[PDB]
Amino acid sequence: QLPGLISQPLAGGGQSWSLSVQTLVFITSLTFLPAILLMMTSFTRIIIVFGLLRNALGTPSAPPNQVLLGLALFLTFFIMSPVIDKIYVDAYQPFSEQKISMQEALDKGAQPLRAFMLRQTREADLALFARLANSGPLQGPEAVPMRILLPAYVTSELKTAFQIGFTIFIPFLIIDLVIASVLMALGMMMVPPATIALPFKLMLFVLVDGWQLLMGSLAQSFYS
Amino acid sequence: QLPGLISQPLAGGGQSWSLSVQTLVFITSLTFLPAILLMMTSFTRIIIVFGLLRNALGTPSAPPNQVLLGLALFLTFFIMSPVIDKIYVDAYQPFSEQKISMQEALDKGAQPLRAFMLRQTREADLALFARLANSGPLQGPEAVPMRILLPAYVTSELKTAFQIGFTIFIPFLIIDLVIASVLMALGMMMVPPATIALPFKLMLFVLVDGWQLLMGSLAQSFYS
Amino acid sequence: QLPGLISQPLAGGGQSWSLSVQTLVFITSLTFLPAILLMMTSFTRIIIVFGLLRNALGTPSAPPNQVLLGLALFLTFFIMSPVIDKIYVDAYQPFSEQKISMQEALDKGAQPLRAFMLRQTREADLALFARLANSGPLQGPEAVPMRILLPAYVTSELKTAFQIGFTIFIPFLIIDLVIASVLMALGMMMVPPATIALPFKLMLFVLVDGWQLLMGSLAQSFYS
Amino acid sequence: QLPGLISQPLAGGGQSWSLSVQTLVFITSLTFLPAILLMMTSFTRIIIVFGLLRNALGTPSAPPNQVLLGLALFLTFFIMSPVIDKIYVDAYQPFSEQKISMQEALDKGAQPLRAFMLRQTREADLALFARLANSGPLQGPEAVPMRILLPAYVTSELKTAFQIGFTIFIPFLIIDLVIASVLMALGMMMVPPATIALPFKLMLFVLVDGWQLLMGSLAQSFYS
Amino acid sequence: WSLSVQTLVFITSLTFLPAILLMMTSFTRIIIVFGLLRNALGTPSAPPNQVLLGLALFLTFFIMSPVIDKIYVDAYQPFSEQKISMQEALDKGAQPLRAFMLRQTREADLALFARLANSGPLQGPEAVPMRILLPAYVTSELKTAFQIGFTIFIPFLIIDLVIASVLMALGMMMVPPATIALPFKLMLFVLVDGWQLLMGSLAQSFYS
Amino acid sequence: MTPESVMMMGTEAMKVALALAAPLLLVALITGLIISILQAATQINEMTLSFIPKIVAVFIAIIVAGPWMLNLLLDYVRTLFSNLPYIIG
Amino acid sequence: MTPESVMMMGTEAMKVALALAAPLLLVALITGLIISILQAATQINEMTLSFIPKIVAVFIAIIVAGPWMLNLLLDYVRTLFSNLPYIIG
Amino acid sequence: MTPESVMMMGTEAMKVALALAAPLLLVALITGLIISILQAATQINEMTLSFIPKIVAVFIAIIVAGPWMLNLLLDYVRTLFSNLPYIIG
Amino acid sequence: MTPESVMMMGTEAMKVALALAAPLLLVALITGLIISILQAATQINEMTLSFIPKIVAVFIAIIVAGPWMLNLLLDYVRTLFSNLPYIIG
Amino acid sequence: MIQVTSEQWLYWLHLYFWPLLRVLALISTAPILSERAIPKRVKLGLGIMITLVIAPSLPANDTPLFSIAALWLAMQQILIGIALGFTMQFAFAAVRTAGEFIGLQMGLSFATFVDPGSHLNMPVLARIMDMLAMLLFLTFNGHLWLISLLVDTFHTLPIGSNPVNSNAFMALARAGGLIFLNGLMLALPVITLLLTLNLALGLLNRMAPQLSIFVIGFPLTLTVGIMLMAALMPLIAPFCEHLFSEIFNLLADIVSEMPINN
C-alpha cells in the first residue's frame, strides 16, 4: 500500500499494483517543477538583470552560468525570507501537530505568496489578463485567481527586469561611446573600440563598487 | 485502474510478479511523452515566438531556456484553463477514484483537445493531410481522426509562430539598420552596432511596454 | 506476458524469488528497445531533416529540442498509422488475452515492419550488405534476413535525409550570401549578416508555406 | 537455474531477506552487464567513429544521440550476427530448458567472443598488458586470460576508432579551410563559414555516396 | 501482503549497492580520468557514458584481479559451500582490501577523517576501520584522478590555444577553433598512440 | 499571408526607418560636406577632422528631434502589436 | 543524384542568387563610383560621404525591384519543394 | 599507423586543398590588385569599390572550374574511404 | 605534488605553446608588415590585399616547420606521460 | 548465507537520509566535486561515504521521508549545501573571469565582440587558468577543508525545523563582488601592457591608415599576450593562496553567523 501505488484485485486473486494518476502527473512533470517554482519567486528578475549585466560588460559568458545561477538563488532566498517565514508560521506551525485541516492549509500557504505577487504586478497587466479572461470585478485580492495572477506577475517582472538592465547598460554605453569617440577623433579608425573599452568598463565597474550597488538596488526596489 | 505491476498465480500456488506491457509502453513513452502531451497544448507557438524574440533582441540566451520554459508554461496554463477544467471535471474527477475505465477516460480527456485543435487548425493543413492519408470526406469533427488532426495542428502552429516571429523582428531590424547606418555615416566603422543597439532595443521595448502587448496579442490570436 | 519475477511459497510463510534468462535479457533490453523501435519507425530521417532545417535557419535551438522531437513523433505517427494498427490487430490483439506467445508475437508484429523497410530500402544498400555478408543464393524477398535488412534500411534513410537536408539548405544559403554581399558592398563590414538574414529567412519560409510543403514532401517521398 | 532470495516474516510487521553471494553478485551485475556485453561486441569502435563523424559535420547533435545509438546497435547486430547465433546455439539453446549448467554455459558463451577479440586485438596491446601483469609466456590463445584480453581489446578498438575518425575529419577540414580562406579573400569577416560549409559538406557526403562507403569500411575493418 | 512489495523495493534498492564495490575498486579514479579526457577532446559525450563505463569496468577488472583472487580464495570459496560464517568471511574479504586501500590513501585525508570522526589514538594501521578508511580513500582517489586528468589535459588546450591564435592572426574571426582543433588533437593522440600510454600509466601509477 | 501584405508591411517598415534616419543621416552628410569644403581652403590632411562636428551635429539632432522619433516608433510598434492577432489568417 | 544533377541545381541556384542581388549590387557600385569620381574632380575626399548615397540608392532599388525579386524567390523555392519527393532518388 | 603515413596523407590532403583554393584565391587576388592599381592611377579613394569585381571574378572562377574541383574532391574522398579499412591495419 | 611543480608545469606548457605558435604568428606578422609597407610606398589601399599573402605565408611555414613542431609536441606528450607516475604523491 | 532483515534495511535508509542529502547538495555544486567528468554514481557514492562518518555522533532526527516535514527538512539541507558550494565557486569564477578578460584583450574571442550569436567564445586561456587554480586547490587540500566545514555546519546547526537565517545568504550574495575585483587584481599587468600595445598600434595607424588591426595588431598582440601569460604564471601561486584563504574565512564567518537567528 504505497502512496503512489494503487492495488485492485482482478480475476483469480490477481492484484494490479498500478501507479496513481497523480503520481503519473508528478513523474511526467518532475523536470518542470523547478521551472514553475523558480518562476513564482524572484528568480525571474535577478536572472535577467545578471544576464543583461553580462551583456553590458561587453564580455558575454565572462562569469560562468552556474555561479550566477547560484548567486541569483541567494538573492531569492534572502528576499523572500519573510514570505517563507509567513508560510511557516501560518501553514506549518499550526499543522505540524495536526491542529488544522489540509484544505485550508494550501490557501494559508498561498495567501502570502498571492499578496507577494500582487505587490509586484502592475495594475495594467492584471486588467489586461482579467479582460482577456472575461472575469468579474475582482475588487479584492482574494478574488484574483492564480490563472490571472501567474502570467501577470511574470509579464511585470520581465518589464521591470528589462528596465533595470537598461539602467545598467546606460553607464557602460556611455563608456563605450566615449572611448570610441576618443579613438576616432584621433584618426584611429582601424582600432576596434571594444578591446580598449573592456578593461575600462571592468575597472569602472569595480571602482564604483558596482556589485554591492546592484545587490542593494535589487533588494530595495523589489519589495517597494 | 491504470497500468502497473501484475501478480498472477501459476501452477501449484506459485505467484509470478512482473510488470505489464502497457507499463513498458508507458515508460518508453515517458522519454518523449511530455513533449507530445505539451505540444497538443499552446506550448509550441509560445515557445517558438519567445525564442524568435530572444534572437531578435540581438542577445541570445539573455533570458535562459528555463525562464522561457516557465513563461511558456504559465501562458499556456492561462490560455487553457477552460480546457484543463473540462478535462478535470470530465476525465480526472470520474477516474481519480475509478468511476470509469482508462480506455474511455482518455477519450473524455481528448474530446476538448480534439475540438480545440480543430478550432486552431487551418483547413488547408487538414485537406493536405487528408489527401496524403487518402481518407474520406471527413465532413464532421467525429470523422477526422487524431492521426490527421495532430500533424496538421502542429504545422498550423509552426506557421503561425514563424509569422508572429517575423512580424516581431521588424522593429528590431529597423533599429539595427538605423543604428548601423548612423554609425557608418559618422565614420564609426569598426564599432560593433550590436553593442550600441541592444540597450536601445531594450529601452524601446520597455517604453512601448511590449511584454504585455506580446502576451495580449498571443492570447487573442491563439483564441481565434 | 512479459518475463518477470517468480515466487513459490516454501515452508512456513516463506517466499522464494527467482528469475529466468528471459527476465535478465528483458530488463537490459528495456534501455535499448525504444531506440531500436525509433530506428525502425523512420524517426531518423524526419528528425535529421528537421535538425538540418534548424541549422539552415541560422538560429540554432530557436524551436527547442523538445518541440522538434515531439513534432517528429507526431509526423511519424501520422505516417505509420497503417503499420501501427496492422501490428495492433496482428500482434497486440492476439497477445493481450494471451492467445499467442511473445516469441511468435514479436516476429508476427515485425512482418509489416519488415515489408515496410524492404519497400523504403534501396537496392544498392541491400546488394552491398548481401555481398558483405558473403551469403549464398538470395532470390526471394522473404529470404532476406533482418540482419541484412536493418543496416541497409538505416543507410538508405540516412542518405535520403541528408539529400533532403542539402536541398533545403539551398534557398537559405542564397539569402545569406545575398545579404552578406549587400552588406559588404555598402561597406557595413562589422554588421553580422545573420541578424538581418533571419527575419528574411522567416519571411520566405512563411510566404512559401514552408511547413506545408516540407511536411507534404516528407510524406509523399516516403511511401515511394 | 539462477540464484534467488528467501524471505520469512519475523513477528509483527517484519521481514528477513536470506541471500547467498551468487545472487548478490547477480543483482549487482544487472545494472552493469548491458554495458559489458556491448564492450565484448563491436559497439565501441562504431559508436566512437559515428560520434566523430557527427562532430566532423560541423553540426553537433544534428542526429540525436538515440539515433546514433540505435544505428550503431543495428550495425553491430549485422556485424556480430554469426557470433550471436553461435552463442544462441551453443549457450542459450542448451540452457533455456536447463539441460546444462550455468557456470559452463558462461564458458561456452565466451569462446566465440574470445575468438572475436583475439581476431581484432593487436599483439602490441597483448604484450603491453602481459608485461604490466607480469604474466607468463602466453604463447597460445587459450593461455591468454580474460583479464588480459579485455583491456587489450578495448585499447585496440579505441585506437582503431580514433584512427578512423581522424581519417574521416580530413575532407571536412579541407572544405572548412578552403571556404574560410575564400571568404577571407573576399572579405566577409562577419560571415560564419559554417553556414556555407555545412550544405557543401552534405553535398560531398551524398555525392561520394559516403554512408555506404563508411558502413562498408566499418564492416570490413573487423574481419581483418 | 505488502511484504511482497517491500521485498521488491529492497531488490530495487540493492541494485544501487554496486556503487560501494566500485568505490572499493579502481573505478572512481579511472572513470574520472576518462571523463576529463572526454572534456579534453572538446567533444563531450563523443564516446557515450555506457562505453566509458564499460571500458572503465574492464580496466578495473584487469587491475583488481589479484585482489579479487585473494577474496575468492579467502572469502568466496569457504562460504559458497557453507564452511564459514558470513560475519567473519566479510572480515576476511576486507584484509586484502585493507592493504590495497592503505597503499593509495594519502595521509592528509586519513588525518582529517580521524580528526572529524572523534576517534582515539591508533597503535596500528590494521586498527583503522572501514568507515574512516573508505571516505579517505575515495577522496584521495578523486584528488589523484583529477591530478592525472589535468596533467594529460594540458597538450589538448595547448593545441586549442595555438590553433585559435593562428586562426585569429589569419583574420578568421568567425571560424570556430574547436572544429579544427579536434582533428589535430586526434591526430596527435593517434601519433603518440596515447591510448596505450594512458592505459599503462593508469595501471602502473595505480599499482604503485 | 499574401505576398502583397508582406510587401505593404515592408514598405511601411522602410518608411518608418527612413523617417528615423533621415534627420541624423542628412545632418551628418551636410556637416561632412561643409567640413570637406572648408578643408580645401586650409589644405589640411587630417583625415578624421570632420568627426567631432559630425558627432556634435548628430547629438544636437538627437536632442532636438528625439521625441518625434520616439513617438513614431512607439506608435508603429503599438500598431504592429495590436494587429498581430489579425495578420494570421 | 548524380554530380551533373547537383551541378545543374547549383547553377540554377547561382542564377537565382545573381538575379536576386544584381540590382542592389550594381546600383550600389554605380553610386559609389559616381560619388568617388565627383570627389576626385572636386579634390575633396571623405570616405563616409559616399555611404549615404549608397544607402539611398539601395533603398530605392529595393522599392523598385522588390516584388520581382520576391516573386523569383517564391517561385524557385516552390519548385524546389515540389521536386523534393522526385529528387530524393 | 606510422608518422610517415600521417605525413604523406597530410601532404596529399594539403595538395587537394591547394588545388581547390588556388584558382579562387588567385583570381580574387588578381582582380583586387587590378582594381587597386586603378584606385592608385586615378585619385579614387572608394573603399569597397573592389568588392563587387572580386565577387564577379570568384563567381566566374567557380562557374568555369566547378566540375574540375568537384571531380577532384570526389575522387579524393572515394580513395580515402576505400583505403579506410586498410590504412588502420 | 607540490605547488611549485604545478607552477613549473604551467610555465613549461606556456613555453611549448609559444614555441608552437611563434613561427606562424611571426611569419604572418612579417608578411603583413611587408604587404602594408608595399602598399604605403604606392597608393593602393584595401583591407583584403594582405589576407591572401598571409594565408600563403602561414601555409608555407606550416609545410616547412611542420615536422619540427610535431616532434616538439610528441616529445612533450611522451615526457608528460613518462613523468606522470613520478608527480603523483 | 548473507542475512538482511527489514529493521536494518530501513533504519539505515531513514537514518542516513538527511546527512546524505546535505552532503550530496554540497557535492553537486562544488569546485571539483561538481564536474560532469565525475559520474552521478560516484557523486552519490562519495556522499554516502561521507555520511558513513557523519551519521555516528549525530542527533537522530528520524521523521518520515514521505511527508511535508521531509520537504521542509530537505529544503534546509539543500540550502546549506548549495550555500557552501556556490560560495566556494567564487575563486574559480574569479580566475576564469581574469583569464577570459586577458584573452579578449589578446583577441582570442573577437566574435563575441561583434555578435553574441553563436557559441564562438571557447575561452581556452581561461580554461588553462581554471585548471591551474583547481590543481592549486588540490595541492592546498581545499576539498578537505570543505568537508570539515560541512561537518562543522552539521555540528553547529542540526537537522531540525529551525529556519536558517537569511542575513547570511544576503551577505554571501553581496560577497559575489569578489569575482570582478580578483579578476582585475590578477590581470592588471597583462591588461595594462596589452592596452599600451594597442595604443601603440593606434599610433602606428596614425602615420599609416593602411596599417590595420587585422593585418598587424592581432598577430603581434597574440604573441605578446602569450609571452606575458608565460611570464605571469609564477604570480598565480600566492594569488590563489590568498584567494582560497579569504573565501574560507568568509565562509567560516557566515557559517558562524547563520545559527544565531533561527
Rounded distance, CA A190 to CA J203, Å? 11
Please report which helix (H) or strand (E) contains residue F4, including its range: helix F3-42
The pair phi, psi for residue D18, each rounded to 5°, is: -75, 130
Q: Quick one: CA dihedral E27, E28, E32, E35, positive or negative?
A: positive
Rounded distance, CA A96 to CA J70, Å? 12
Rounded distance, CA J239 to CA J176, Å? 18
Q: Does residue G89 sit at the D interface (CB-CB below 8 Å)?
A: no
D27, D40: one domain: no
Q: Collapse the DSSP code of A7 into the 3-class scheme (helix H, G, I; strand E, B; otherwise coil) and give the result.
A: strand
Rounded distance, CA I64 to CA F88, Å? 62
Rounded distance, CA J90 to CA J182, Å? 10
Is chain A adjacent to chain D, meaning 3+ CB pairs within 8 angstroms?
A: no
Rounded distance, CA D37 to CA D45, Å? 14
Rounded distance, CA H13 to CA G89, Å? 31
Residue of J22, J244, J255 whose CA lies nearest to J137: J244
Q: Does residue A17 sit at the E interface (CB-CB below 8 Å)?
A: yes
Rounded distance, CA D166 to CA E189, Å? 10
Interchain proximity H51–D186, CB inside 8 Å: yes
Terminal Cα-to-Cα distance of chain A (whole angstroms): 49
With CA atoms as reference, the chain E residue closest to D187 would be E171
DSSP assignment of I17-70, as one string?
HHHHHHHHHHHHHHHHHHHHHHHHHSS---GGGTHHHHHHHHHHHHHHHHHHHH
Give contacts of E2 with chain A, Cβ < 8 Å.
Answer: 1
C30, C45: one domain: no
Give Cβ neighbours of residue B167 (< 8 Å, ≥ 6 apart): F9, F80, F84, F87
Cell of G3: 554530380
Residue of A167, A217, A193, A206 whose CA lies nearest to A58: A193
- The Cα-based distances of B66 to A48, D175, E194 in angstroms read 12, 37, 40
Rounded distance, CA D26 to CA D36, Å? 14
CB atoms within 10 A of CB B131: 12
DSSP assignment of E26-77, as one string?
THHHHHHHHHHHHHHTT-TTSS-HHHHHHHHHHHHHHHTHHHHHHHIIIIIH
Residue of A8, A5, A79, A7 whose CA lies nearest to A42: A79
Residue of I42, A185, E165, B187 whose CA lies nearest to J202: A185
Q: How many CA atoms lie within 13 A of D24 on its CB side?
A: 14
Give Cβ neighbours of residue A33 (< 8 Å, ≥ 6 apart): none
Cell of J252: 567560516
A22, A36: one domain: no
Rounded distance, CA D100 to CA H24, Å? 72
* Cβ–Cβ under 8 Å, residues G33 and G50: no
* Buried residues in C72-105 as b, exposed as e (16+ CB within 10 A): bbbbbbbbbeebbebbeebbbebbeeeeeeeeeb
**Distance (Å) from the alpha carbon of J118 to chain B's nearest alpha carbon:** 8
Give the residue from C207, C217, C220 with the most G CB atoms within 10 Å of its CB, the best one to mutate. C217
Q: Collapse the DSSP code of B169 into the 3-class scheme (helix H, G, I; strand E, B; otherwise coil) and give the result.
A: helix
Cell of B87: 478535462
Q: Collapse the DSSP code of B16 into the 3-class scheme (helix H, G, I; strand E, B; otherwise coil) and give the result.
A: strand
Rounded distance, CA H16 to CA H20, Å? 6
DSSP assignment of F23-86, as one string?
HHHHHHHHHHHHHHHHHHHHT---TTTTHHHHHHHHHHHHHHSHHHHHHHHHHHHHHHHHHHHH
Q: Quick one: CA dihedral A34, A35, A38, A41, positive or negative?
A: negative
Give Cβ neighbours of residue J249 (< 8 Å, ≥ 6 apart): none
The DSSP 8-state label assigned to residue A120 in this structure reads T
Gapped junctions in chain I, after residues (C–N > 2.5 Å): none
Gapped junctions in chain E, after residues (C–N > 2.5 Å): none
Residue of H68, C37, E56 whose CA lies nearest to B31: C37
Domain membership of residue F27 as a residue range: 1-89
Interchain proximity D21–J1, CB inside 8 Å: yes
How many structural domains comprise chain C? 2
CB atoms within 10 A of CB D2: 13
Residue of B171, B124, B166, B156 whose CA lies nearest to B222: B156
Rounded distance, CA E86 to CA E84, Å? 7
Amino acid letter, residue E73: V
Q: How long is chain I?
A: 89
Rounded distance, CA B14 to CA C8, Å? 4
Rounded distance, CA J164 to CA J25, Å? 16
DSSP assignment of C25-81, as one string?
HHHHHHHHHHHHHHHHTTHHHHHHHHHHHHHHTT-TTSS-HHHHHHHHHHHHHHHTH
Rounded distance, CA D138 to CA D143, Å? 5
Rounded distance, CA J135 to CA E128, Å? 29
With CA atoms as reference, the chain D residue closest to J112 would be D190
Task: Return the ∠ at Cα J104 (arms to J98 and J109), rounded to 5°.
Answer: 125
- The Cα-based distances of B57 to B52, B135, I69, I79 in angstroms read 9, 45, 45, 50
Residue of E180, A79, H66 whose CA lies nearest to D166: E180
D88, D107: one domain: yes
Is D207 a member of any domain? no
Give the residue from B6, B15, B16, B17 with the most E CB atoms within 10 Å of its CB, the best one to mutate. B17
Cell of C84: 501501427
**Distance (Å) from the alpha carbon of A152 to chain J's nearest alpha carbon:** 27
Q: Does residue C134 sit at the B interface (CB-CB below 8 Å)?
A: no
Q: Collapse the DSSP code of B5 into the 3-class scheme (helix H, G, I; strand E, B; otherwise coil) and give the result.
A: strand
How many structural domains comprise chain I? 1
Sheet holding C5-7, edge to edge: A5-10, A14-19, B4-10, B14-19, C5-7
Q: Collapse the DSSP code of J208 into the 3-class scheme (helix H, G, I; strand E, B; otherwise coil) and give the result.
A: coil
DSSP assignment of C69-132, as one string?
HHHHHHHHHHHTHHHHHHHIIIIIHHHHTTSS-HHHHHHHHHHHHHHHHHHHS-HHHHHHHHHH
Rounded distance, CA A32 to CA E104, Å? 43
Q: What is the resolution of this structure in A?
A: 3.0
Interchain proximity C44–D205, CB inside 8 Å: no
Rounded distance, CA J186 to CA J98, Å? 6
Rounded distance, CA E142 to CA E145, Å? 5
Distance from chain centroid for Cα B58: 24
CB atoms within 10 A of CB J146: 22
Is chain I adjacent to chain J, meaning 3+ CB pairs within 8 angstroms?
A: yes
Amino acid letter, residue J67: S
Rounded distance, CA G57 to CA G24, Å? 8
Rounded distance, CA D204 to CA D210, Å? 8
Give the residue from F26, F29, F50, F52 with the most G CB atoms within 10 Å of its CB, the best one to mutate. F29
Residue of B83, B109, J246, E101 whose CA lies nearest to A147: B83
Strand C9-10 with C14-17, pairing: antiparallel
Amino acid letter, residue C188: M
A26, A117: one domain: no
Cell of H30: 588578381
Strand A14-19 with A5-10, pairing: antiparallel
Give Cβ neighbours of residue I45 (< 8 Å, ≥ 6 apart): H36, H39, I39, J209, J210
Rounded distance, CA J176 to CA A63, Å? 11
Chain C / chain E CB contacts < 8 angstroms? 7
Q: Does residue C7 sit at the B interface (CB-CB below 8 Å)?
A: yes
Rounded distance, CA J159 to CA G82, Å? 67
Give Cβ neighbours of residue J52 (< 8 Å, ≥ 6 apart): E131, E134, E135
DSSP assignment of A134-164, as one string?
T-----SGGGS-HHHHHHHHHHHHHHHHHHH
**Distance (Å) from the alpha carbon of J210 to chain I's nearest alpha carbon:** 6
* Cβ–Cβ under 8 Å, residues E206 and E33: no
Give the residue from D28, D36, D79, D190 with the most C CB atoms within 10 Å of its CB, the best one to mutate. D190
Residue of C194, D174, C189, C56 whose CA lies nearest to J118: C194
Rounded distance, CA B186 to CA F29, Å? 9
C26, C47: one domain: no
The pair phi, psi for residue D8, each rounded to 5°, is: -130, 130
Residue carrying C-alpha cell 490560455: B79
The DSSP 8-state label assigned to residue C4 in this structure reads -
Rounded distance, CA J32 to CA J139, Å? 13
Interchain proximity J105–A199, CB inside 8 Å: yes
- The Cα-based distances of C135 to C129, C145, C200, D217, E199 in angstroms read 9, 10, 54, 18, 39
Distance from chain centroid for Cα B90: 23
Rounded distance, CA D186 to CA I48, Å? 7
Rounded distance, CA A191 to CA A197, Å? 11
Rounded distance, CA B91 to CA B85, Å? 10
Give the residue from E201, E204, E208 with the most I CB atoms within 10 Å of its CB, the best one to mutate. E201
- The Cα-based distances of A90 to A80, A110, A114 in angstroms read 15, 10, 14
Give contacts of C198 with chain D, Cβ < 8 Å.
Answer: none
Is D5 a member of any domain? yes
Rounded distance, CA D211 to CA H81, Å? 10
Q: Collapse the DSSP code of D7 into the 3-class scheme (helix H, G, I; strand E, B; otherwise coil) and give the result.
A: strand
Q: Obtained via which technique?
A: cryo-EM
Give Cβ neighbours of residue D100 (< 8 Å, ≥ 6 apart): D94
CB atoms within 10 A of CB E200: 18
The DSSP 8-state label assigned to residue A63 in this structure reads S
The DSSP 8-state label assigned to residue D92 in this structure reads I
Per-domain boundaries in chain J: 68-261
- The Cα-based distances of C50 to G13, H52, J119 in angstroms read 22, 35, 21
* Cβ–Cβ under 8 Å, residues H89 and D164: no
Residue carrying C-alpha cell 557600385: G29
D52, D27: one domain: no
Rounded distance, CA J58 to CA J69, Å? 19
Strand B4-10 with B14-19, pairing: antiparallel
* Cβ–Cβ under 8 Å, residues J87 and J251: yes
Residue carrying C-alpha cell 497486440: C92
Residue carrying C-alpha cell 573505478: E27
Rounded distance, CA B16 to CA F37, Å? 99
Residues of D with CB under 8 A from a CB of I: 181, 184-187
Residues of C with CB under 8 A from a CB of G: 122, 159-160, 163-164, 167, 170-171, 173-175, 177-178, 181-182, 185-187, 204, 207-208, 210, 213-214, 217, 220-221, 224
Q: Collapse the DSSP code of E124 into the 3-class scheme (helix H, G, I; strand E, B; otherwise coil) and give the result.
A: coil
Cell of D172: 571536412
Please report which helix (H) or strand (E) contains residue J12, including its range: helix J6-28
Domain membership of residue D158 as a residue range: 36-167
Interchain proximity J117–C194, CB inside 8 Å: yes
The DSSP 8-state label assigned to residue A4 in this structure reads S
Q: Does residue E51 sit at the J interface (CB-CB below 8 Å)?
A: no
Interchain proximity F28–G70, CB inside 8 Å: no
